[PDB]
């Protein structure tokens, strides 16, 4: 553990950049609570112009050891700088949403609907293609050679988003626990009608994450709905609120299945309510998406907020091609 | 040409013209089914061809319209006890066969499971074949060229009957409103998860039948469950209780869809609880099944009880082939 850090620091001296980067990663793979590695890797990353990652490391170091002097002097400088960097990116997104606020766009909107389904289902392991999804939703006929469950995941999504767009989007008032159960009722209804629209009865594992016990789900969902209809959350930038709402639901994991799908849809509800286009996390982005969700469980929700913001920009860029 | 047909039918009956009179009598009742004089005349005519059961139905129909019609009374006062004994004897013939039914049989039981689904779905209009149903339930893969809704009807049935057999069949105690909503939850869950497991909110028409208003469904369902757990129903022969339970549910029509399917399964619940094999109303029997259900709405539940009893015998006969 300490052997790797002393080796990484020596490699950093005079040359050997990629030899040190993998050595630093090794010392943190050995022990991610290595206060000395975190600050060293943080100071190292700041040299390659990555202040955001550096600050993450100094921050991770401080939660472990609050009076570590090297982490403090560094963090006392990055904290305000990183907050401005984040705030600037949000203004860049706002300028693009101002541009999107004003036949070619209609052809993009209809295909991105079928596309959103493709990615939201594929990210969970759905082997279906975009042409098969486009067929299933248009003919209502079964795609030959593919399982019923996979095609029922697709119908379920469609029923969920047609529900949000007709009932929920434009609706005035506070978001309730019944609304979330109603989205889940459609998401999972064609795959598991017994568990669709109802709270988890058993205890589950999501990677290395153990969600609240089924006995406490109802209470934690009550607090979450209350936070959605609170003014602290209402004061956040739309992208930050939408990412936090998504993380919090996913964290509670109130359902046996369809947590990620319901969250991604609740995220789009938050966005669209504040006049933002619906957003799509791609099949290819899965590995990064699970990495940033892990980083939030560990204590820092910021990388996930930036991930959701990179997605909002890539969705706003794709629309501005026409 | 109402009384004109009856006077013509009676003349045709004199000396000869049997089939000319039978269609003439049917015409007079197609013109007016509340023709007290046609009903008694057709009743006296049918008794000549050895059909006492149909005759009694007619004399009974005549008496509900006109209670003091002398010709209908003298005839009914003779058929009522005779027809009750005829019915009671058929029930004893069924009991003797259930006593007989109490590797070759195992091969019949497994195929009749897939068969029961084929008929219960086809009777509602499902274009799927027995080989396609056998595929869907074994591979869980979609049948090419057929709609998703039709295959989801099949999965739904299977979930419903696996539920009844594991939870409900052997269960000791009273049958509740929650049990019926739980069967419906599976029956219709893969086709309409929003309406599956819940009572009708709108008013519907079933042929010429207008079921109770959605406001009264809950009260009528409360009375029905109470009748299932009552001792008057408990004193009836198993076949008569199972047929009455099926008619009463179907009459209330508490669901937008899957009433016939839930009833047919509740019927099998009643039968199996009293040690009878599960019963199958065939695709081909549809026209007779809807005829006898109409006859009950009109005031006489007996033809439907005999229909369900003919089904129980044909199911007991098929088992005794091995
Ligand atoms: N490390 C982690 N900690 C917490 N939540 C995580 C996580 N990694 C993934 N998740 C979330 O949990 C979802 C996967 O959870 P699972 O229990 O595997 C099935 P699921 O709820 O059916 O998700 P789905 O709707 O994407 O299919 C992801 O889509 C994501 O939103
Ligand atoms: N004249 C009648 N009066 C009352 N019920 C009748 C009837 N004719 C038919 N039925 C019952 O009502 C069912 C058909 O009702 P519908 O409203 O058409 C659709 P359903 O409930 O989805 O039936 P399903 O499960 O057979 O598909 C029949 O299967 C039968 O059990
Ligand atoms: Mg899943
Ligand atoms: Mg039908």
Author numbering:
A (entry chain G): 106 to 207, 213 to 432
B (entry chain A): 105 to 206, 213 to 432
Report text from the authors:
AMPylation (or adenylylation) is the transfer of AMP from ATP to a Tyr or Thr/Ser residue in target proteins. Interestingly, in eukaryotic genomes only one FIC-domain containing protein has been identified to date, HYPE or FICD, and it is strongly conserved from C. elegans to humans. Here we describe the first crystal structure of a eukaryotic HYPE encompassing the two TPR-motifs, an α-helical linker, and the FIC domain of the human protein. We demonstrate that HYPE forms stable dimers with structurally and functionally integrated FIC-domains and with TPR-motifs exposed for protein-protein interactions.
The structure of HYPE E234G with the nonhydrolysable ATP analog, APCPP, shows a different position of the α-phosphate that would be incompatible with catalysis, suggesting that APCPP is not a physiological ATP mimic in this case. However, the basal activity of the wild-type HYPE is probably lower when compared to the E234G variant. It has been previously documented that the proposed intramolecular inhibition in several FIC domains (Engel et al., 2012) can be reversed by replacing the critical inhibitory Glu residue by Gly, using autoAMPylation as a readout (Goepfert et al., 2013). A Mg2+ ion is visible in the E234G variant of HYPE; it bridges the α- and β-phosphates and is coordinated by the conserved Asp367 side chain.
